[PDB]
Write a protein that binds this ligand. Structure first.
Ligand SMILES: Nc1nc2c(ncn2[C@@H]2O[C@H](COP(=O)(O)OP(=O)(O)O)[C@@H](O)[C@H]2O)c(=O)[nH]1
Ligand SMILES: [Cl-]
Ligand SMILES: [Cl-]
Ligand SMILES: [Mg+2]
Lengths: 170, 201
């Protein structure tokens, strides 16, 4: 079974690291493949990696055709990236991918309790995204589901792609 | 309210610069702020700014050209993003399409020194207004690159995260995409070798 997954979300919010776990270099356009088994079904999952910068807004629609599931990411140490979910990512994805299931993914979960992150966000009167805030946003945009993960610690990563696969298969 | 009605954004570059003040005030304001407070920000120009706040910054500037960023609470990525919006909203790209063709031709020259000299000759063909602003932005990006051990933004990374803003490329097909690899390289060269291209003693 072949299914197509596209991942989108703010620049540097952790998209490529999430794919790879399954360097400091921004992606322009890359493709990967992952094999996943869920519910007795074996799926060959094509992973379409995209650029999060607005510089590449006119390029991203090259990745959207015939998509089976969307990973829509933000980073838990970036409340800006969460605010960009309803402001930028959801309108774009729903414009180009109607009726495609969206997994809302909170990346970098390891930084929520990180003292350095909390100290640095504090200087800007910010704090890490709370789990409830992520879940509420997933509810708000009508996501297929909400998942938090850390590519760094691997926490929740397997669960993200299993959910994405089940979404694609359904 | 709506950006169409702005007399500052989405209007020709020549209407928001003068011979006496060749850098748009908004661009000077954003870049000075970023140099003062943002040079140690990991992934400055890579990390996406808050889109809603970027638009808010633009509207507040519309209302008051004397807007004080040191006074407001816009974060560095918001200022960086709003700065990019100025260039993406220009009626025509900062680097004119006719110049991009000439730059691509120059870049194919195999001999390194000949290549760099050829690229500099193309610079002299830019409209003077565009040249001054292009110089200003590239020189800023070069200064950002000097702190790349901390902010991780090499000239390569800065090019990847800024050249389409400056050139407004055709991204309509895969073949069009591969044809843009030269643009990335060209802007990387202008940033890395900024002194050769833009210094005057
Ligand atoms: N602490 C932490 N850092 C991460 C994680 N995932 C990615 N990063 C870092 O975030 C930066 C950008 O990640 P990347 O996946 O390339 O971003 P994207 O492809 O632009 O969304 C890199 O410095 C990564 O090391 C994570 O789960 N935890
Ligand atoms: Cl113009
Ligand atoms: Cl040089
Ligand atoms: Mg990437």
């Amino acid at each position: 079974i072949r299914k197509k997954l596209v991942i989108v979300g703010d620049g540097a919010c952790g998209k490529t690291c999430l794919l790879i776990v399954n360097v400091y270099v921004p992606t322009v356009f890359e493709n990967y493949v992952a094999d996943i088994e869920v519910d007795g079904k074996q799926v060959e999952l094509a992973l379409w990696d995209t650029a999060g910068q607005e510089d590449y807004d006119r390029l991203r629609p090259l990745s959207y055709p015939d998509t089976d599931v969307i990973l829509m990411c933000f980073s838990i140490d970036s409340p800006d990236s969460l605010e960009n979910i309803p402001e930028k990512w959801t309108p774009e994805v729903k414009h180009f991918c109607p009726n495609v299931p969206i997994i809302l993914v909170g990346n970098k979960k390891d930084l929520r309790n990180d003292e350095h992150t909390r100290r640095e966000l504090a200087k800007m009167k910010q704090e890490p995204v709370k789990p409830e805030e992520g879940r509420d946003m997933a509810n708000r945009i009508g996501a297929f589901g909400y998942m938090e993960c850390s590519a760094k610690t691997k926490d929740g990563v397997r669960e993200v792609f299993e959910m994405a696969t089940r979404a694609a298969l359904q | 309210a709506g950006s169409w009605e702005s007399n500052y954004f989405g209007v020709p570059l020549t209407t928001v610069v003068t011979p006496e003040k060749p850098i748009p005030i908004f661009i000077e304001r954003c870049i000075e702020y970023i140099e003062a407070t943002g040079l140690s920000t990991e992934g400055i120009y890579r990390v996406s700014g808050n889109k809603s706040e970027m638009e808010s910054l633009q509207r507040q500037f519309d209302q008051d050209h004397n807007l004080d960023l040191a006074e407001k609470d816009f974060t560095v990525n918001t200022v960086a993003g709003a700065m990019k919006s100025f260039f993406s909203e220009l009626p025509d790209p900062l680097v004119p399409y006719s110049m991009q063709i000439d730059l691509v031709e120059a870049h194919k020259i195999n001999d390194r020194e000949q290549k760099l000299h050829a690229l500099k000759e193309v610079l002299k063909k830019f409209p003077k207004e565009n040249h001054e602003v292009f110089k200003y932005v590239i020189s800023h990006l070069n200064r950002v690159s000097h702190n790349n051990k901390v902010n991780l933004m090499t000239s390569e990374n800065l090019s990847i995260c800024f050249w389409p803003t400056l050139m407004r490329p055709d991204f309509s097909s895969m073949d069009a995409l591969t044809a843009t690899r030269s643009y990335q390289t060209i802007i990387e060269l202008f940033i890395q070798q900024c002194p050769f291209f833009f210094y005057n003693r």
